[PDB]
């Protein structure tokens, strides 16, 4: 009603989804009224580098099973291909090769074809294309026009969706204006927003894109994807910061999910609710209903708590806000003779985190198997805060100098080990707090050695 295409694009780098996960995702999609899937995993060689090579029968049979499942689930299956690393745009033989590659899909009932040119060189690679075209946009437009014209003479109502080589940031770029002029209007055009993974997508922004393209764009929305340098981040937070009236300027939205499919269901649930009724969408309401349905009511408050340490994404790029504020508050308490209050706050927070871990660790489902590395490092950060508690308590009492010194040793050791953490759970917020415990307790080492009388800042003797 609001969006014609309400989709998932499997378009990420990293380990492609398993055949069974795709089939399962199609059931999740139907449950939440998502009606469109694009096959485009970057690490499938036959999608991209070896785009000329046809799929073997074993693979084509799996595609047939996917296509039939999609149809039974009310999902339009789109097969995408990415030829732009080596395509000779002007070559008649190359067109024939692409048509040969997609023919098995045409014969299995797929009428929607993706042809993507993201992440390729910004200028023409081949001399024969430089002789035929003034620039990339012209070559691509002519190629896509010719592919469409061929498909109209092959099947009934073919549809092409293309991804431009410039797919984010400046909507008034010359390339985009050439593409809007020269692409036939019914070829759909992808766009990811102001950034690759966009913080916000506004109506104003998509209005501009619409003008240059001379058509409503289709959004390739890069959330919850956590590929490449984002792999350490667990993107489980709600879909957010997409204007309630984007539907006016956008024909549809495909979400690029994580290589963790079960974990993706949490934000994808919220994404689907936004698409269903964007004017009544509340991300916190949606996220809580998502957690209840998918993971169970009894894990809700534990998930709420655990999510506070997994906020980092394009949607919430800052260091985790709750813990950032809390440790600043605790440090002010210590700096203002409110020792009991600061220690209490730290104590209560540790208990909350232990309870949260213990609760979620008890659950056996696939979701909790996928997010286990984040749970493990979450517990570790909690163990370290517990030792910070001991260190501060013994600092304020003073004999307990031994327990304080011992805590400094422990913290020094684990802060070094924490350099090797694989995830971005708790950001660097717990790290920086623990490092400051180390800095805040320098003078007890000086006191231990009777060096206070001659040690100068930063806490050394010199001449």
């Amino acid at each position: 009603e609001y969006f014609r295409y309400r989709g998932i694009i499997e378009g990420f780098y990293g380990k492609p989804w398993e055949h069974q996960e795709r089939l399962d995702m199609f059931e999740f999609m139907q449950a939440n009224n998502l009606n469109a899937y694009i096959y485009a995993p970057k690490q499938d060689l036959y999608h991209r580098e070896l785009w000329r090579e046809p799929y073997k029968e074993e693979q084509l049979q799996l595609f047939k099973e996917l296509i039939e499942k999609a149809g039974s689930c009310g999902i339009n299956f789109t097969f995408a291909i990415s030829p732009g690393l080596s395509l000779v745009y002007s070559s008649e033989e190359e067109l024939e090769t692409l048509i040969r590659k997609i023919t098995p899909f045409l014969e299995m009932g797929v009428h929607s074809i993706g042809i993507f040119f993201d992440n390729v060189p910004f200028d023409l690679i081949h001399e024969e294309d430089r002789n035929s075209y003034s620039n990339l946009a012209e070559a691509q437009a002519d190629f896509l026009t010719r592919v469409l014209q061929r498909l109209e003479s092959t099947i009934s109502t073919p549809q092409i969706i293309m991804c431009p080589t410039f797919y984010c940031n400046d909507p008034n770029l010359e390339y985009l204006r050439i593409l809007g002029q020269r692409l036939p209007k019914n070829i759909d055009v992808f766009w990811t927003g102001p950034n690759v993974c966009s913080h916000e997508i506004t109506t104003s922004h998509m209005q501009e894109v619409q003008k240059s393209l001379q058509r409503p764009a289709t959004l390739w929305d890069n959330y919850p994807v956590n590929d490449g340098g984002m792999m350490p981040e667990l993107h489980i937070g709600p879909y957010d910061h997409r204007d309630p009236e984007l539907h006016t300027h956008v024909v549809g939205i495909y979400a690029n999910p994580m290589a963790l499919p079960e974990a993706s269901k949490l934000p994808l649930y919220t994404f689907a609710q936004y698409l269903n009724s964007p004017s009544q969408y509340n991300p916190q309401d949606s996220w809580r209903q998502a957690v209840s349905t998918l993971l169970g009511e009894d894990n809700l408050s534990a998930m709420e708590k655990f999510y506070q340490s997994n906020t980092i994404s394009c949607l919430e790029p800052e260091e985790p806000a709750y813990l950032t504020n809390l440790f600043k508050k605790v440090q002010e308490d210590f700096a203002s003779f409110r020792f009991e209050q600061g220690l209490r706050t730290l104590r209560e927070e540790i208990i909350s985190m232990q309870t949260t871990y213990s609760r979620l660790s008890t659950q056996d489902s696939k979701f909790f198997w996928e997010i286990r590395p984040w749970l493990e490092e979450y517990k570790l950060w909690t163990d370290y805060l517990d030792q910070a508690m001991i260190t501060f308590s013994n600092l304020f009492t003073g004999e307990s100098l031994q327990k304080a010194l011992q805590g400094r040793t422990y913290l020094r050791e684990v802060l070094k080990d924490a350099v090797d953490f694989r995830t971005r759970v708790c950001g660097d917020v717990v790290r920086n707090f623990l490092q400051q415990v180390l800095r805040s307790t320098v003078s007890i080492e000086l006191q231990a050695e009777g060096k206070e009388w001659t040690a100068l800042p930063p806490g050394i003797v010199r001449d």
Binding site: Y13, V196, C197, N222, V225, D227, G228, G229
Partner: peptide
């Protein structure tokens, strides 16, 4: 930093 960058 995304893989696409």
């Amino acid at each position: 930093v995304p893989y696409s960058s």
